[PDB]
């Protein structure tokens, strides 16, 4: 789990994928009631090169 506040923090963390698009949508869903401190997770059991 991670705590996200800015879009640049999520872009650094999450390079791409649907999850980043969902974070963007959530912070841009409404003009007046965008949420905060969104908690994100990667479900892929990936490994490093």
């Amino acid at each position: 789990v991670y705590e996200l506040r800015n879009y640049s923090q999520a872009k650094r963390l999450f390079r791409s994928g649907e999850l980043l698009d969902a974070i963007e949508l959530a912070w841009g869903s409404n003009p007046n009631y965008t949420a905060g401190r969104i908690l994100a997770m990667r479900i892929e059991d990936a490994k490093p090169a």
């Binding site: 003009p31 007046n32 009631y33 965008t34 905060g36």
Partner: protein, 234 residues
């Protein structure tokens, strides 16, 4: 210069946009002329836009409305809560954290070599923002003796000399000096005594500080857009 940019909405018309912004449908021809649109101005989908991408716009395309917009004179009610937080954060400034380790310089308030820089844990210098910044600045001013800081005779406080007798008079002197030191800050709209007491050696007191309101900070920062400095030289 700044202008409004409109995203084409589903089954929107140019007349509706003109009514919405210019307050009259008559400007739709000006809107067409400025955006350089062919007769089917707002096509149903991108398949029609493929026929003439230059001169047609589809749903989700951004139009430009040349009305001179300005970020001041904007109703704060529209502004998002996160946007208001960022605006007050800008208004109250960002500074390097020096008041870390509160216990140490609270144990030695009158002495020098009491505070120091610190790291944020991510290998960068630590930073205090918004309320933390105001706390840091007010603590530093109160703790600084007046006239000790170079290039700034009036910055500081005279509390180092107010270690006098245990009577109400010295209490009042301390209170007046503290109110002077707090009023010296431009951001502090006012300060006032809450309660005080004397326990022989030890004096104790508490104050209430009202920083500038969200509305004032928002107005100040949005006015600063005209200059683009977005910085504090108070």
């Amino acid at each position: 210069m700044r202008f409004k940019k409109h995203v084409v909405q589903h089954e929107e018309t140019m007349q509706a946009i003109a009514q919405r912004y210019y307050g009259d449908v008559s400007y739709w021809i000006d809107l067409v002329e400025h955006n350089n649109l062919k007769y089917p101005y707002l096509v149903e989908t991108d398949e029609e836009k493929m026929k003439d991408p230059e001169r047609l716009a589809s749903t989700g395309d951004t139009l430009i409305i040349p009305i001179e917009s300005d970020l001041t004179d904007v109703s704060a009610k529209e502004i998002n809560s996160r946007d208001k937080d960022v605006l007050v954060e800008l208004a109250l400034g960002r500074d390097l954290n020096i008041t870390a380790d509160e216990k140490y310089f609270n144990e030695h308030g009158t002495s020098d070599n009491i505070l120091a820089f610190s790291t944020n844990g991510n290998g960068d210098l630590d930073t205090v923002k918004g309320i933390d910044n105001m706390k840091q600045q007010l603590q530093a001013r109160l703790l600084t003796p007046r006239g000790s800081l170079m290039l700034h005779p009036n910055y500081g406080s005279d509390l180092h000399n107010l270690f006098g007798l245990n009577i109400p008079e010295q209490a009042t002197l301390i209170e007046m000096e503290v109110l002077r030191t707090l009023t010296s800050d431009n951001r502090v709209k006012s300060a006032n005594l809450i309660d005080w007491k004397i326990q022989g050696n030890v004096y104790s007191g508490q104050f209430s500080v009202e920083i500038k309101s969200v509305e004032e900070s928002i107005n100040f920062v949005l006015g600063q857009d005209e200059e683009g400095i977005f910085a504090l030289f108070e």
